[PDB]
Amino acid sequence: ASLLDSNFVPINFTEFVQAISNTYKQRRIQFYENLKRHKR
Amino acid sequence: LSINERITKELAEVEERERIEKQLLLEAERINEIDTLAKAHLSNHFNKEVLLAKGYTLKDIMQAQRRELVRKFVPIEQIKAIAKVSDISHIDGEILEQLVSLAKVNIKLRK
Amino acid sequence: VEERERIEKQLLLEAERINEIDTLAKAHLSNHFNKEVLLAKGYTLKDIMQAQRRELVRKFVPIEQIKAIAKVSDISHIDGEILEQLVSLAKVNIKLR
Amino acid sequence: LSINERITKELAEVEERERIEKQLLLEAERINEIDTLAKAHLSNHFNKEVLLAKGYTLKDIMQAQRRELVRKFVPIEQIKAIAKVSDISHIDGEILEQLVSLAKVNIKLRK
Amino acid sequence: VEERERIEKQLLLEAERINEIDTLAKAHLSNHFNKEVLLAKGYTLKDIMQAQRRELVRKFVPIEQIKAIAKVSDISHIDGEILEQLVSLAKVNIKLR
Numbered sequence: 001a002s003l004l005d006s007n008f009v010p011i012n013f014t015e016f017v018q019a020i021s022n023t024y025k026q027r028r029i030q031f032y033e034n035l036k037r038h039k040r
Numbered sequence: 041l042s043i044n045e046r047i048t049k050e051l052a053e054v055e056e057r058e059r060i061e062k063q064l065l066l067e068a069e070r071i072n073e074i075d076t077l078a079k080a081h082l083s084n085h086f087n088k089e090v091l092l093a094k095g096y097t098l099k100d101i102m103q104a105q106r107r108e109l110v111r112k113f114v115p116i117e118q119i120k121a122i123a124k125v126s127d128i129s130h131i132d133g134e135i136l137e138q139l140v141s142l143a144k145v146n147i148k149l150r151k
Numbered sequence: 152v153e154e155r156e157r158i159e160k161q162l163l164l165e166a167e168r169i170n171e172i173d174t175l176a177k178a179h180l181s182n183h184f185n186k187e188v189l190l191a192k193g194y195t196l197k198d199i200m201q202a203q204r205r206e207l208v209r210k211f212v213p214i215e216q217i218k219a220i221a222k223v224s225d226i227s228h229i230d231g232e233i234l235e236q237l238v239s240l241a242k243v244n245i246k247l248r
Numbered sequence: 249l250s251i252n253e254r255i256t257k258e259l260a261e262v263e264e265r266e267r268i269e270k271q272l273l274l275e276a277e278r279i280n281e282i283d284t285l286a287k288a289h290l291s292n293h294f295n296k297e298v299l300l301a302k303g304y305t306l307k308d309i310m311q312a313q314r315r316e317l318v319r320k321f322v323p324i325e326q327i328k329a330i331a332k333v334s335d336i337s338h339i340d341g342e343i344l345e346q347l348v349s350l351a352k353v354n355i356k357l358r359k
Numbered sequence: 360v361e362e363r364e365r366i367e368k369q370l371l372l373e374a375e376r377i378n379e380i381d382t383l384a385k386a387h388l389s390n391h392f393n394k395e396v397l398l399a400k401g402y403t404l405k406d407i408m409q410a411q412r413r414e415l416v417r418k419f420v421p422i423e424q425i426k427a428i429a430k431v432s433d434i435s436h437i438d439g440e441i442l443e444q445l446v447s448l449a450k451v452n453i454k455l456r
Contacts (some may be wrong), residue, residue: 007149061404065373068381075378098371121239122220140235141219148215163306166275170283173276196269 002026070102078105081112081147103132110139113146169200176203179245180210201230208237211244278310286313287322289355311340320345321354367387377408384411388418409438416445419452 002008003023010016078086082105091101107128110119116126122138123131132138173186182188184206189199205226208217218224221233221239228238255297286294290313314329315336318327330346331339339347361436381394390396392414398405416425426432429441429447437445 005151007151064370064374064377064404067370068378071375071378072382073384098369098375099368112223118240122236127167136184138220145213145215145219151212160305161287162272162275166272167279167306169272170276174280174283196272216310 071098074102074105077109082108103136106140107132109134109143113150114139115141118142139150152204170209172203172207173199175245176207180194204234204238205230207241208234211231211241211248214236279306281302282310282313285317314344314348315340318344318350321351321358322347328349328352377404380411380415381410381422383414384456389413409442412442412446413438416442416448418447419456420445 001019001022003019004026008019010019074141075088077089084090086105086108088098088101090099091104096104110128119128119139120126122142123135125131129137179244180203184203189202190196194202195206208226214224217226217229217237221229221237224228226234226237284298286296293300294313294316296306296309299312300306304312318336327336327347328334330350331343333339335349336344381424384392389412391402392411394407398404417435420452422432425437425445428435429445431437434442434445
């Protein structure tokens with residue numbers, strides 16, 4: 001249910017918007033997973 | 041045996057050894073692919089270690105993992121069409137290679 | 152004369168296969184690949200049938216199966232038992248479609 | 249074998265292949281006509297799919313549809329006159345072709 | 360043809376041995392000794408495998424066992440059944456490690 005999946009084929013604009021929101025969330029999750037703050 | 045005969049024999053020998061080396065690389069890649077597929081898509085009970093402990097040849101382990109992957113991914117209709125039969129117990133070979141290629145396509149599209 | 156009888160049996164078999172292929176292709180691909188216009192363009196009957204089969208594969212069978220099962224992306228030269236497997240997969244695809 | 253013999257053999261071979269191609273087209277048209285007649289004038293139980301499931305040859309299906317169409321459209325007197333007998337169980341052939349032509353005429357005039 | 364069948368059996372055996380050696384060596388020694396870069400540098404497959412084995416011995420097997428069991432400090436020329444014993448001892452060492 002995200003734009004990242006190539007197999008994903010949106011059917012209407014509403015599904016397309018939902019995929020965008022899911023895609024934004026996944027990037028935020030991935031960003032925090034990969035984030036490495038400076039402790040000094 | 042003249043010089044041309046010497047040269048053609050030398051070149052043929054070199055090419056034969058090169059082809060054998062390429063075959064060895066292909067076998068190594070096949071074993072790596074089987075290992076990755078067994079780790080990623082099949083249960084731990086199908087690991088090469090436990091199968092070898094049960095006393096199966098390496099080729100038996102490979103065709104085993106392939107048949108299990110085909111059943112897991114490839115649908116029964118596709119098996120009955122490409123392999124012409126439902127049972128994969130006696131379909132090891134080039135048809136099995138086509139079936140595992142279809143299984144790779146299936147997992148790629150599944151992701 | 153039974154040899155010619157069996158030859159006629161095989162003739163009927165391939166004629167039925169051709170008719171089925173044509174009937175499904177007309178409703179699936181286009182009218183541009185109709186037997187009449189292809190014959191006018193100057194293609195033999197077997198060439199017409201194999202071209203229609205390749206187009207059927209190019210419509211139903213996805214490209215990944217072509218480059219894995221048939222080992223080549225281009226169906227232009229794969230004809231044979233591999234083409235039979237491809238058209239069988241296309242039949243399965245249109246059945247599930 | 250001189251040049252004229254070469255040319256006559258080449259032309260005869262080409263003409264033979266052309267006649268075979270025309271025969272294949274004729275067979276395709278015959279199958280299409282049988283399909284249309286079976287769909288339009290005969291019950292669903294006579295469909296090629298169910299008949300083939302019952303295990304009948306394609307030619308058997310064709311002559312079957314033809315005999316049924318003759319009984320449905322062509323009157324019994326016309327059958328007894330043209331085919332010289334009432335039963336059509338053993339009249340498959342050119343006489344059957346004449347009977348189905350008469351049946352086509354009958355449906356055309358019926359509409 | 361069963362002679363070629365058994366030859367293929369031995370081919371599979373040595374291919375599996377090569378794959379196992381490569382998989383453990385990649386995670387233990389370095390990426391500099393990868394098969395691709397070694398082949399680019401111009402070493403045959405058997406030479407690559409024996410060099411990787413000698414490096415495995417030089418990593419796990421301590422030097423005293425090399426100069427006592429293998430009778431020479433330099434593994435550069437000890438190849439053979441002594442090298443098999445050395446790689447077995449290296450396997451034991453990595454197992455206990």
